[PDB]
Amino acid sequence: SPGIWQLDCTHLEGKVILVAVHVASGYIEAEVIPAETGQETAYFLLKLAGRWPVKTVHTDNGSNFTSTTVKAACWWAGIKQMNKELKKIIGQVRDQAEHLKTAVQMAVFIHNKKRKYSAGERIVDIIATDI
Amino acid sequence: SPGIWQLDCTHLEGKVILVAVHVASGYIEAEVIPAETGQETAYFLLKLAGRWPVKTVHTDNGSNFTSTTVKAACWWAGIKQMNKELKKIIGQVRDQAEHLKTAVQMAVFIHNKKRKYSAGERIVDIIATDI
Ligand SMILES: Cc1nc2ccccc2c(-c2ccc3c(c2)CCCO3)c1[C@H](OC(C)(C)C)C(=O)O
Ligand SMILES: Cc1nc2ccccc2c(-c2ccc3c(c2)CCCO3)c1[C@H](OC(C)(C)C)C(=O)O
Numbered sequence: 001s002p003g004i005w006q007l008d009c010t011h012l013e014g015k016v017i018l019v020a021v022h023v024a025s026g027y028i029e030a031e032v033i034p035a036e037t038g039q040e041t042a043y044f045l046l047k048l049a050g051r052w053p054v055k056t057v058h059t060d061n062g063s064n065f066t067s068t069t070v071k072a073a074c075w076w077a078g079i080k081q082m083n084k085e086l087k088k089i090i091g092q093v094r095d096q097a098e099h100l101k102t103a104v105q106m107a108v109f110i111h112n113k114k115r116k117y118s119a120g121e122r123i124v125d126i127i128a129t130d131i
Numbered sequence: 132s133p134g135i136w137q138l139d140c141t142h143l144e145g146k147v148i149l150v151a152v153h154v155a156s157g158y159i160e161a162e163v164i165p166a167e168t169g170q171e172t173a174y175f176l177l178k179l180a181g182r183w184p185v186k187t188v189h190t191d192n193g194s195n196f197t198s199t200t201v202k203a204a205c206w207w208a209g210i211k212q213m214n215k216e217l218k219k220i221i222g223q224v225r226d227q228a229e230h231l232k233t234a235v236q237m238a239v240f241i242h243n244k245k246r247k248y249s250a251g252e253r254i255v256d257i258i259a260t261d262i
């Protein structure tokens with residue numbers, strides 16, 4: 001179903017990477033964050049919700065969504081309640097960038113553009129079809 | 132044409148807001164950045180290019196794209212070479228958030244979801260149709 005996303009954090013090089021997966025297509029977005037915090041999670045959700053029609057969000061760590069900040073983002077935005085593949089791509093491209101965050105965006109790009117349609121095409125098709 | 136984006140920075144409260152507009156649909160993405168720098172512009176482009184099929188980028192300040200960092204992002208990603216409306220929405224929502232960056236994501240959301248279809252729907256339709 002088109003309005004469902006999963007959100008989790010992973011760790012790499014002593015930093016945190018927030019990873020959202022659009023479950024039906026396999027499309028991802030990701031950001032490197034200072035801290036695994038309610039505030040970064042909330043902020044990220046607001047950005048996500050402005051781009052795609054986000055209806056529900058799931059996570060593998062339910063305590064992620066406990067803060068007042070997250071609940072306030074989900075309320076305002078109307079929302080209700082690849083780790084290893086991505087780390088694989090990141091490791092393939094890692095020597096070509098100085099900052100981890102650059103390598104992560106490189107790996108998101110590679111992941112979303114790779115064919116079997118690509119995840120980036122699937123999301124847009126799934127969402128356009130649902131309009 | 133579906134692969135064309137415009138990118139510019141504006142200023143507000145002594146901060147910089149990077150604003151990308153998908154020209155055919157009127158869809159926007161935006162981020163608050165510390166400095167108007169080549170590095171932030173490059174990083175932003177990499178993120179943008181991983182989400183949408185970005186073919187060409189325009190700007191109102193051509194010197195924006197002069198750095199080695201920007202040229203390197205555009206090379207790697209395969210890329211070639213609302214200010215007032217957004218500031219209007221930001222001013223409408225500004226008292227409801229503590230940080231400017233929150234208000235900016237609120238205004239992006241409001242802008243992309245507002246009907247005459249919404250910009251968020253137009254982009255996905257335009258892009259799906261082009262696949
Ligand atoms: C600092 C901060 N503190 C809070 C304390 C508890 C109440 C929620 C918040 C939110 C938040 C605020 C507004 C908001 C959304 C989430 C959702 C959108 C409508 O308004 C923020 C915001 O900052 C973060 C997003 C970084 C957490 C803010 O800038 O105001
Ligand atoms: C610090 C930095 N310095 C440079 C000096 C000149 C050469 C380009 C860069 C780039 C850049 C790097 C790789 C890259 C793209 C842009 C495009 C993608 C393929 O690799 C970066 C990157 O950092 C920023 C993105 C913040 C500028 C980096 O992390 O390596």
Ligand SMILES: [Mg+2]
Pocket residue numbers: 007008009010059060061064
């Ligand atoms: Mg997690």
Ligand SMILES: [Mg+2]
Pocket residue numbers: 138139140141190191192195
């Ligand atoms: Mg500018």
